[PDB]
Every structure is written in C-alpha cells, then in structure tokens.
PDB file of C-alpha atoms in Angstrom:
ATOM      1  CA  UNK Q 459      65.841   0.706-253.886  1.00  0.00           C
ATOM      2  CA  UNK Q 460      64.900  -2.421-251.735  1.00  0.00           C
ATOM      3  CA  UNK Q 461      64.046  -1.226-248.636  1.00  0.00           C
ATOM      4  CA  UNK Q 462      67.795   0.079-247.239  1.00  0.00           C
ATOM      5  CA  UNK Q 463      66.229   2.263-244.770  1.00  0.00           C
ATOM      6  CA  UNK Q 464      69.585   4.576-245.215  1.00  0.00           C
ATOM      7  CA  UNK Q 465      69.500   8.128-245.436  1.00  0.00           C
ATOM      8  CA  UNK Q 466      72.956   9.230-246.657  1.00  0.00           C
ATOM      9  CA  UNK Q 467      72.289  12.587-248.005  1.00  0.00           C
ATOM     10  CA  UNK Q 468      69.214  14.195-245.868  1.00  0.00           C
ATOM     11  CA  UNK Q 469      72.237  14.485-243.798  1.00  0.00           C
ATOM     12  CA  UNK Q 470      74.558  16.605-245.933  1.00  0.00           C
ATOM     13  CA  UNK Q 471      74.317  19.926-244.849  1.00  0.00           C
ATOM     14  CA  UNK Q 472      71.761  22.958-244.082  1.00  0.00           C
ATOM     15  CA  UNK Q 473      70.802  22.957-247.815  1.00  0.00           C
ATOM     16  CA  UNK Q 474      67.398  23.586-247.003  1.00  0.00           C
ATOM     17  CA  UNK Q 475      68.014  27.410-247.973  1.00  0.00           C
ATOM     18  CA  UNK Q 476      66.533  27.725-251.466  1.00  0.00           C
ATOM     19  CA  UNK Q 477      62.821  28.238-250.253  1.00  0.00           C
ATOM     20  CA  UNK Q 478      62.699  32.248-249.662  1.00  0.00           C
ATOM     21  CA  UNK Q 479      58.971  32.454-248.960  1.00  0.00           C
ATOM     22  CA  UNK Q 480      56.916  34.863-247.503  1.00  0.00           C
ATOM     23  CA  UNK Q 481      55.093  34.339-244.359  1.00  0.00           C
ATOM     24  CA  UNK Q 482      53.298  31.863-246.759  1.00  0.00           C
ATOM     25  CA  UNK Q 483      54.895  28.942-243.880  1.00  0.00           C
ATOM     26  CA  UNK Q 484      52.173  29.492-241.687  1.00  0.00           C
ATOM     27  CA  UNK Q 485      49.449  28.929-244.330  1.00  0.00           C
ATOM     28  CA  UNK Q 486      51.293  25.716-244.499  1.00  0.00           C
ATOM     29  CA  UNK Q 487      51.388  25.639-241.073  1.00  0.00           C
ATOM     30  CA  UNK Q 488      47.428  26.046-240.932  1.00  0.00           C
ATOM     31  CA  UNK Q 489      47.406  22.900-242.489  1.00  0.00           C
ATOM     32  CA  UNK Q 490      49.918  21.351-240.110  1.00  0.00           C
ATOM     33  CA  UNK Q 491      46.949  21.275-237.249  1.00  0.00           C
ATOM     34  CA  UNK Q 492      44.701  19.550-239.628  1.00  0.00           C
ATOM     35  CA  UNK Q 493      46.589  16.438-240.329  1.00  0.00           C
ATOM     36  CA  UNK Q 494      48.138  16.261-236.629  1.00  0.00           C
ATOM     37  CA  UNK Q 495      44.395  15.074-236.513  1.00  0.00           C
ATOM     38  CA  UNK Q 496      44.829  12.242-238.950  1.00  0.00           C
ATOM     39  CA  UNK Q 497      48.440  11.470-238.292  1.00  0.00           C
ATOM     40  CA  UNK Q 498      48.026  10.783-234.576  1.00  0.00           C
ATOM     41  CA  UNK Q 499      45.336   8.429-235.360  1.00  0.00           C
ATOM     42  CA  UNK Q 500      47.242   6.989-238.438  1.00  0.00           C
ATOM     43  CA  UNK Q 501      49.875   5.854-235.958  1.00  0.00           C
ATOM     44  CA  UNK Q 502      47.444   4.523-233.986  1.00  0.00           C
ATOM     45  CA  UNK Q 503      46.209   2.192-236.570  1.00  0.00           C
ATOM     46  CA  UNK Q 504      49.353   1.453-237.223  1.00  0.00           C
ATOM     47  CA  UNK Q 505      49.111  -0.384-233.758  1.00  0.00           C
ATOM     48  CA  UNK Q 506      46.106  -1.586-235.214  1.00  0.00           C
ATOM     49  CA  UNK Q 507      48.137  -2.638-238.029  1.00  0.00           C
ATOM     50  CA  UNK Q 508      51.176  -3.631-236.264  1.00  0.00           C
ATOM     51  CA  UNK Q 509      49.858  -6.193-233.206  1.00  0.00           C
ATOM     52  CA  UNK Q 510      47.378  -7.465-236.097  1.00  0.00           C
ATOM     53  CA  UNK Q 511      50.620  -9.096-237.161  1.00  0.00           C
ATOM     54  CA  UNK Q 512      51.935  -9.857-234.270  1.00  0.00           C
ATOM     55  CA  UNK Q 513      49.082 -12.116-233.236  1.00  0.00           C
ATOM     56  CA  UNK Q 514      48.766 -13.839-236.557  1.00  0.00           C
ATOM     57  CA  UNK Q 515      51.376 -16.213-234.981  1.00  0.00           C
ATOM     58  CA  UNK Q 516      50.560 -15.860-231.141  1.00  0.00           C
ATOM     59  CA  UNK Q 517      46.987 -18.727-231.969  1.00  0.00           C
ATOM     60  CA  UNK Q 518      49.728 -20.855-232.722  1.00  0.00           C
ATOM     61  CA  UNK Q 519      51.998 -20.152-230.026  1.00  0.00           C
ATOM     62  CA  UNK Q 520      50.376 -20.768-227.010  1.00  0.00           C
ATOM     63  CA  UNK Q 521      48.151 -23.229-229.137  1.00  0.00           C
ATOM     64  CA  UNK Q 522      50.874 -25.451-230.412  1.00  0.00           C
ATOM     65  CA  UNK Q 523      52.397 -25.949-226.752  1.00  0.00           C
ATOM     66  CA  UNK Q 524      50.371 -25.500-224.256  1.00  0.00           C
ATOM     67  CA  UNK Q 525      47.242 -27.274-223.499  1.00  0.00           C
ATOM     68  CA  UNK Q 526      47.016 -26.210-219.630  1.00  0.00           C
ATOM     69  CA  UNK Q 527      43.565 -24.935-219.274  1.00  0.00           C
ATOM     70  CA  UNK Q 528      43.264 -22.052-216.513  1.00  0.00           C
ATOM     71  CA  UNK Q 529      45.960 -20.549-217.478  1.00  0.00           C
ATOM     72  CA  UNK Q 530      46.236 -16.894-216.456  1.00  0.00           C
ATOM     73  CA  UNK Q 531      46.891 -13.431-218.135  1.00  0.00           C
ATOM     74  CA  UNK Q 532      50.634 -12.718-216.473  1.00  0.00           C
ATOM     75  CA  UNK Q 533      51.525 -15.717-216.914  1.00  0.00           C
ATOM     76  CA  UNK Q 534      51.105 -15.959-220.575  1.00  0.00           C
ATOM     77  CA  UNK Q 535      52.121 -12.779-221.309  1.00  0.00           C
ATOM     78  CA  UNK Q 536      55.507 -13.280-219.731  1.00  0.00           C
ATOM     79  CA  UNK Q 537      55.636 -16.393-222.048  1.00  0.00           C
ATOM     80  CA  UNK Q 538      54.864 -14.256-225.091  1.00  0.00           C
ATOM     81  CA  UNK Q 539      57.518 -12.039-224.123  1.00  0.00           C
ATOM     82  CA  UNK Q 540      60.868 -13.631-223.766  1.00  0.00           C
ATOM     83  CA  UNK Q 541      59.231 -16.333-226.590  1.00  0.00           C
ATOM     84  CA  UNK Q 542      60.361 -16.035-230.164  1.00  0.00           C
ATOM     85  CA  UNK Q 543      59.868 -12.358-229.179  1.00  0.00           C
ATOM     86  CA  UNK Q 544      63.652 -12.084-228.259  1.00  0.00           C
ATOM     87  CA  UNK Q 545      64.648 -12.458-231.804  1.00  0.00           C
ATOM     88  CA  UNK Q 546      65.012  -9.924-234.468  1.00  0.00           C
ATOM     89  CA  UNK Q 547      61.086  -8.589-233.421  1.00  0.00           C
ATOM     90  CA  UNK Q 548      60.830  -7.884-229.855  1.00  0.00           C
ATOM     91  CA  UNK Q 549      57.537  -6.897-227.990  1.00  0.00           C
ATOM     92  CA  UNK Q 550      57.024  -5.493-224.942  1.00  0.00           C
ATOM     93  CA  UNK Q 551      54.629  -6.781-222.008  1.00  0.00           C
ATOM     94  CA  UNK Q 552      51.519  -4.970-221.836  1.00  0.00           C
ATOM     95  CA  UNK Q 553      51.678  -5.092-225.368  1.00  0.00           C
ATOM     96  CA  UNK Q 554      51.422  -8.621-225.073  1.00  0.00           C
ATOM     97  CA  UNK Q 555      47.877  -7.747-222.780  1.00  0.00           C
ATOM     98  CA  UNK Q 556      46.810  -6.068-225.645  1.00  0.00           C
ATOM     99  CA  UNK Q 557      47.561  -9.192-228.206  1.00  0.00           C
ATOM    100  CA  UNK Q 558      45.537 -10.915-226.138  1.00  0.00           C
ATOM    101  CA  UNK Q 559      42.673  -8.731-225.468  1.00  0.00           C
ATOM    102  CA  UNK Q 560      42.802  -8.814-229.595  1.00  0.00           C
ATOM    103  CA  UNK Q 561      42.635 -12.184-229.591  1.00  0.00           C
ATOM    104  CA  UNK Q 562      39.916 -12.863-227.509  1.00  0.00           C
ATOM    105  CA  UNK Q 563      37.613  -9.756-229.178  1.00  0.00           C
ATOM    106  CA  UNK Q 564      38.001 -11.374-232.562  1.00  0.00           C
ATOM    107  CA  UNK Q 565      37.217 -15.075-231.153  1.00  0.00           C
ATOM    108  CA  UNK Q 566      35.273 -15.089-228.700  1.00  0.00           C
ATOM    109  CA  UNK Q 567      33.629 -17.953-229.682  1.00  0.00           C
ATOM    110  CA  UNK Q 568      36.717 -20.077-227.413  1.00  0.00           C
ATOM    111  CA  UNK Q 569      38.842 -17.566-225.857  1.00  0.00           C
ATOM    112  CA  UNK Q 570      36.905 -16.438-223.316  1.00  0.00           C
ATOM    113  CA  UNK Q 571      38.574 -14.442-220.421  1.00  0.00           C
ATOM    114  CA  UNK Q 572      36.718 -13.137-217.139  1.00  0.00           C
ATOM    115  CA  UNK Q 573      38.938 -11.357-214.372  1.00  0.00           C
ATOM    116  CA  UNK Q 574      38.330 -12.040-211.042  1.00  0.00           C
ATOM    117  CA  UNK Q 575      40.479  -9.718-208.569  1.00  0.00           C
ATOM    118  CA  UNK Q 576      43.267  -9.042-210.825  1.00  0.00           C
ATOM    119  CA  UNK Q 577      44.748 -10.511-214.075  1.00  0.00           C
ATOM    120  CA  UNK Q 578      42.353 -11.647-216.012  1.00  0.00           C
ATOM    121  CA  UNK Q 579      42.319 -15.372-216.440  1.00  0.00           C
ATOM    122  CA  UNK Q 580      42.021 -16.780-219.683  1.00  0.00           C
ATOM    123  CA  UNK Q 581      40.142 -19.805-221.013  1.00  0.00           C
ATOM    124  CA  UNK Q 582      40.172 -23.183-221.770  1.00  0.00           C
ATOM    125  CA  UNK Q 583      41.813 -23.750-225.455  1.00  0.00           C
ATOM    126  CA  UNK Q 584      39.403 -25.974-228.465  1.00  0.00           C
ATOM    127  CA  UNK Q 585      42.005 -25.401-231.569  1.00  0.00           C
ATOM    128  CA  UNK Q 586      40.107 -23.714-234.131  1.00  0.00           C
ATOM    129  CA  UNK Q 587      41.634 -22.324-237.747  1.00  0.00           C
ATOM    130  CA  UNK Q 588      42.139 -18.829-237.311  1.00  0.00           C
ATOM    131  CA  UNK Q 589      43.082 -17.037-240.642  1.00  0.00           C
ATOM    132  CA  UNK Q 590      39.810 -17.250-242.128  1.00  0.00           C
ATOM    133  CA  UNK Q 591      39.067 -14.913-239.278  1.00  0.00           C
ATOM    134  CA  UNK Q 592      42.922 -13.073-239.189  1.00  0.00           C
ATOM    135  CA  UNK Q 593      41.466 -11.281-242.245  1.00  0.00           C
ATOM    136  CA  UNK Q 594      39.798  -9.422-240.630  1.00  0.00           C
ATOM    137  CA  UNK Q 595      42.386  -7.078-240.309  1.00  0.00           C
TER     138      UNK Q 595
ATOM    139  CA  UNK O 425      80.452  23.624-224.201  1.00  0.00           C
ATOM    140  CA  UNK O 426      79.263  24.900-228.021  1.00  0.00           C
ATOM    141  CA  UNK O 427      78.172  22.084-230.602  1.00  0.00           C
ATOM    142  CA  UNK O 428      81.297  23.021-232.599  1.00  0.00           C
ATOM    143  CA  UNK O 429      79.738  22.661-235.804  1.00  0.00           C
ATOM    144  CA  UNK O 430      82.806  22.497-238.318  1.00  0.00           C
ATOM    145  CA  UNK O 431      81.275  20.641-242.308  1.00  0.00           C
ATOM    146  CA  UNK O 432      83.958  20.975-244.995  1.00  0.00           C
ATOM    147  CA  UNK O 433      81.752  19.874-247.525  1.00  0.00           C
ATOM    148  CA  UNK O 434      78.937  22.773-249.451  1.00  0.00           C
ATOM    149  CA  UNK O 435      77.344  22.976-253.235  1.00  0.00           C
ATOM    150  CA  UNK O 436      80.272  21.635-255.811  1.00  0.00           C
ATOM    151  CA  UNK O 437      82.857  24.161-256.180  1.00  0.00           C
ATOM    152  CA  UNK O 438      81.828  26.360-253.113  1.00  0.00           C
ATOM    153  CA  UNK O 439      84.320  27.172-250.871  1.00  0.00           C
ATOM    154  CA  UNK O 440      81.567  27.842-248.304  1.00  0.00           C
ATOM    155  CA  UNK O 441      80.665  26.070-245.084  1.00  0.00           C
ATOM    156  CA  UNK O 442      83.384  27.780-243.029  1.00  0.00           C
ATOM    157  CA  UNK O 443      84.772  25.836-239.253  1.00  0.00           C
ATOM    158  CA  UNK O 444      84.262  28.769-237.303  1.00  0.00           C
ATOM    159  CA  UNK O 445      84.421  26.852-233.684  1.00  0.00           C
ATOM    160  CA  UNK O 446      86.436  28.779-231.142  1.00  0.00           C
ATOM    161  CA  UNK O 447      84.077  31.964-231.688  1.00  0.00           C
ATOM    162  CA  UNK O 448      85.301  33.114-228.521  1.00  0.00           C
ATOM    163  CA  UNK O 449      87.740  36.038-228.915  1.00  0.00           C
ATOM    164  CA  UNK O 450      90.621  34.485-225.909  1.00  0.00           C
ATOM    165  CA  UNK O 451      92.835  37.679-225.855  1.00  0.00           C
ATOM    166  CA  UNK O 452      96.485  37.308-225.487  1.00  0.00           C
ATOM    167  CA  UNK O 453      98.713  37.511-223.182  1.00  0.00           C
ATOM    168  CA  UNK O 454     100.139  40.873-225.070  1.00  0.00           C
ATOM    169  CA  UNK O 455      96.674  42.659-224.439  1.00  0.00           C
ATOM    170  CA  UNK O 456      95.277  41.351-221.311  1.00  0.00           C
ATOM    171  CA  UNK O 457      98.092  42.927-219.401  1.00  0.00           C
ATOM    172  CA  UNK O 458      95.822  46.607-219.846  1.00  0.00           C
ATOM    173  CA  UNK O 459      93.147  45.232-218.032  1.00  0.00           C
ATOM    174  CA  UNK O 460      95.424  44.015-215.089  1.00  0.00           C
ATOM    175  CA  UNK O 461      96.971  47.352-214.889  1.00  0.00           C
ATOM    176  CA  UNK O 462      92.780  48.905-215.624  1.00  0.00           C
ATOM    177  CA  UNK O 463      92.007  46.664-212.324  1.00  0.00           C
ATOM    178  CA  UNK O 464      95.187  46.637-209.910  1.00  0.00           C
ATOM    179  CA  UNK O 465      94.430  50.997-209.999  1.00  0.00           C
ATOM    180  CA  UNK O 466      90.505  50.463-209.806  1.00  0.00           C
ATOM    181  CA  UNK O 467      91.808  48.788-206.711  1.00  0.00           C
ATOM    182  CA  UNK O 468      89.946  45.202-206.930  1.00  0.00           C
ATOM    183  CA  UNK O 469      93.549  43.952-206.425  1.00  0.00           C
ATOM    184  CA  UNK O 470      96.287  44.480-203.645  1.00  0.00           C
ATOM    185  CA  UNK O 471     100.141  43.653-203.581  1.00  0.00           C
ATOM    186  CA  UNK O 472     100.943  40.983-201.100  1.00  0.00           C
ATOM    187  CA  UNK O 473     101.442  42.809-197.948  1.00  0.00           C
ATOM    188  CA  UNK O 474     101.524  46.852-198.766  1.00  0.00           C
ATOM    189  CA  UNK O 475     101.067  49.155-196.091  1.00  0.00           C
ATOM    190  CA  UNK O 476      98.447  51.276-197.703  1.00  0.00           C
ATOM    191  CA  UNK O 477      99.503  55.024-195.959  1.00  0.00           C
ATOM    192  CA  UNK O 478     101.769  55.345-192.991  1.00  0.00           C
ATOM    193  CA  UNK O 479     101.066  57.034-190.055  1.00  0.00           C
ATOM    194  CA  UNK O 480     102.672  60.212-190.691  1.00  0.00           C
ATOM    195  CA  UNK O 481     105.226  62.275-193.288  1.00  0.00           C
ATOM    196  CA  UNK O 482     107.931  60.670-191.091  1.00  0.00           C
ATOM    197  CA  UNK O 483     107.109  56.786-191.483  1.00  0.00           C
ATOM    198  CA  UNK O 484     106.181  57.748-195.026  1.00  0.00           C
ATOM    199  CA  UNK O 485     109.365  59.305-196.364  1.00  0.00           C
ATOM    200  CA  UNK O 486     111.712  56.626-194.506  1.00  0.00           C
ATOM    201  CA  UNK O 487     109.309  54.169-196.342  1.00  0.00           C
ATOM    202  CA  UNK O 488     110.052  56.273-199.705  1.00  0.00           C
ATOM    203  CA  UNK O 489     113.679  55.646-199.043  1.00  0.00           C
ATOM    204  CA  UNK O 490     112.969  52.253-199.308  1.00  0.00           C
ATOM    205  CA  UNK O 491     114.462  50.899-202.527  1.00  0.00           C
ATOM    206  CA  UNK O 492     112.022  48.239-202.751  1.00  0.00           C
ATOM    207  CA  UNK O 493     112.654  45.021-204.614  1.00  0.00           C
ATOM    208  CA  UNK O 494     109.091  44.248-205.702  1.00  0.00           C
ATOM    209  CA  UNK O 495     110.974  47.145-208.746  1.00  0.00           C
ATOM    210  CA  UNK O 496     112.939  44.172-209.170  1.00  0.00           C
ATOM    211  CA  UNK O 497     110.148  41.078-209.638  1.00  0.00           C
ATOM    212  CA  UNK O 498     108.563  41.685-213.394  1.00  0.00           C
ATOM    213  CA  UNK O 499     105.390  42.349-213.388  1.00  0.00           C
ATOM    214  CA  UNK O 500     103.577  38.751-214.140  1.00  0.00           C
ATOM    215  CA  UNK O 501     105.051  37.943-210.583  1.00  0.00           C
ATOM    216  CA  UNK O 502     103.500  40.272-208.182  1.00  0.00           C
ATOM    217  CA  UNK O 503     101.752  38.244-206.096  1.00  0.00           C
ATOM    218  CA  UNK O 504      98.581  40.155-205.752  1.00  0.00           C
ATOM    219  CA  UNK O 505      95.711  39.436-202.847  1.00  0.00           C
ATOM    220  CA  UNK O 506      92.409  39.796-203.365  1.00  0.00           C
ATOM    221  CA  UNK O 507      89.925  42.581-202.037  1.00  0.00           C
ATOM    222  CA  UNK O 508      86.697  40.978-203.183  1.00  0.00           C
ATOM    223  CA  UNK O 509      86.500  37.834-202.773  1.00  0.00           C
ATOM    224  CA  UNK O 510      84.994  34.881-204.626  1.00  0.00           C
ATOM    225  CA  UNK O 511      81.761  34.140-202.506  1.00  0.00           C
ATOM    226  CA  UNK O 512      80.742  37.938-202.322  1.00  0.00           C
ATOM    227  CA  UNK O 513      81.501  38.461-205.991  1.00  0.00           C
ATOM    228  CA  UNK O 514      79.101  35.571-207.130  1.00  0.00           C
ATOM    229  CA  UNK O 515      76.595  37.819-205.115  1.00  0.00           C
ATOM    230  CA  UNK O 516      76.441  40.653-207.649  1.00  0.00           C
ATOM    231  CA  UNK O 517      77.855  40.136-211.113  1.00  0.00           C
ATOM    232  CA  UNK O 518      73.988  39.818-212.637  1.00  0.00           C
ATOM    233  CA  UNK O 519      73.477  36.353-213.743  1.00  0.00           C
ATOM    234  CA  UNK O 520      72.566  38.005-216.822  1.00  0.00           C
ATOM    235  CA  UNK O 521      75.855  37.715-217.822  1.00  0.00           C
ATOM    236  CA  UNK O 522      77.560  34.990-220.003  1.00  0.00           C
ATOM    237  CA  UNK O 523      80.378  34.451-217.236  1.00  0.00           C
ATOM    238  CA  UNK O 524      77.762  33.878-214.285  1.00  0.00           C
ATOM    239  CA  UNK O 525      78.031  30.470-214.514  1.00  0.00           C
ATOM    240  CA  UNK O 526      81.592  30.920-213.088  1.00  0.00           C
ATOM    241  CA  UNK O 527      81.653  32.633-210.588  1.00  0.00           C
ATOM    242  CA  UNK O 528      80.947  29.994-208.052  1.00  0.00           C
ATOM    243  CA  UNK O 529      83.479  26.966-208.673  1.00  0.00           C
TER     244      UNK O 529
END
C-alpha cells in the first residue's frame, strides 16, 4: 500500500517456528559477514543520498536571504539548523558542516571556504543555477 | 522483575500461547510452617528471651515447673530473635544464588 510505514502483524507472536533447519543457519550466517560489508556502506550512501537532498534547497536558503559576504561556518550552520529544519525534517548541526562541505566540493567555482584558526569561513556569494549541477547526485 | 510475557492470541483455533507469569512457586502459608519448625530446631532462630540451660538440676526442674504461657500464644506469634544476623548472612549465602540479591536491603 502507499507508503503506511505500519507493521501490524510482524508483531503477532513468536510464529517464527516453522523453519526446523539444520545447522544450515550458519551457512546463512557465512553470508551474513559478506553483506555487513555492503550494508554498512549502503547506509553510508544513503548519507550520500540523504544530505544530497537536503542541500538541493540549502543554495537557495542562504542564497535567497542573505547577501552578507564573510560570513562564517558556525554561524550559518546554526541558521540552517533551527531554519525550515524545525519542521516535519529536522537536521542536526554538524550535519549541517557536512551540507556545506557538499556544497562547496560540488561548486567550487563560488563557494570557496578557507579556515583560518577555527571554523572555516565561507565565501562571498555570485548566485549561480545549481540543479544543472544537483544532478550530480 | 520478569517481562511477564502473557499473548492470548496463537494460529486460529489454537488454544496455545499460555499466560504463565507468576512462575514463581510462593508456597502457602499451610506449608511454609515445616520450614519454620526445620529452622527454629536447626537453631538459626531463638524465642524472645529463653534461658538456654540453667545452672544446675535445681534451677532447671523449678524452671520445668514453670507452666509457661508462651503454651498459650499460637505459634505464628512467638516472637523469635535472630542468631545470624542480616549483615553476616549477606557474607556467605553464595551470590550464586537467585535470592542474593536480597540479602542486603
């Protein structure tokens, strides 16, 4: 059905009792290892995935409001946060670092940021168009 | 301190899935009554105030003559006094055990 993430029945009962295998688990098991490999790193793309969205709206949030030019790294990120980001989709801080690392890696034609002692400062916004590079997800 | 697992519900028609919860056998007051009587002779207990063994024959027998009243009191009203107490007892009952967790407060 649409997306109901319910789960009414995995909850009945220990019906998981039908199965009378052998030791045959552990070959299954000896698989188990295998995709730990993958699955870790799937979830980590999945941050790969999931800032990708994040940040297809953060070039027009501190675009479309704020034109100060040397503005720094906590600052900004403590404006992500507690922006739009405490609606239904919150983020958390250093999260917010990492959206903007992102954001700077794939344009670094204008976002340039160099740290000095400690935050690194951030650089002066030009207002490009940014989809035609967003996928590049 | 047990999950108390107690479903009703099993495969249509299956009267399984019993509530078994209290799965500790609390003995009644009927029974328990043995084991007092098994400790107050193994001598972990004491009456009140009981003069263990007089001095002599003499105090003895006048303290035989004694119809005592304690007769009287049932037996769930003995006040007994204690010969080992709490503190040391925590000291050797083997943590082992499923009670250990009790015997300090």
């Amino acid at each position: 059905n649409s997306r109901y993430l319910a789960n009414s029945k995995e909850n009945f009962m220990y019906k998981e009792k039908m199965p009378d295998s052998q030791a045959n688990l552990m070959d299954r098991l000896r698989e188990r290892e295998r995709r730990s490999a993958a699955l870790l790193s799937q979830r980590q793309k999945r941050y790969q995935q999931f800032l990708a969205m994040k940040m297809t709206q953060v070039f027009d949030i501190l675009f479309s409001l704020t034109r100060g030019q040397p503005y720094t790294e906590t600052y900004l990120s403590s404006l992500i946060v507690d922006s739009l980001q405490d609606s239904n989709n919150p983020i958390g801080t250093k999260e917010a670092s990492e959206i903007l690392a992102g954001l700077q890696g794939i344009l670094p034609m204008d976002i340039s940021v160099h740290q000095v002692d400690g935050g690194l400062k951030v650089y002066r916004w030009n207002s490009l168009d940014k989809n035609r590079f967003s996928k590049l997800l | 301190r047990i999950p108390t697992v107690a479903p009703t519900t099993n495969v249509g028609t299956g009267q399984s899935t019993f509530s078994i919860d209290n799965t500790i056998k609390l003995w009644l007051k009927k029974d328990v009554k043995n084991v007092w009587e098994n400790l107050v002779q193994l001598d972990f207990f004491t009456e009140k105030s009981a003069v263990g063994l007089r001095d002599n024959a003499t105090a003895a027998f006048y303290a035989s003559n004694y119809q005592f009243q304690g007769t009287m009191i049932p037996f769930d009203l003995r006040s007994y006094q204690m010969q080992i107490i709490l503190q040391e007892l925590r000291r050797i009952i083997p943590k082992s055990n499923m009670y250990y967790s009790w015997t300090q407060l």
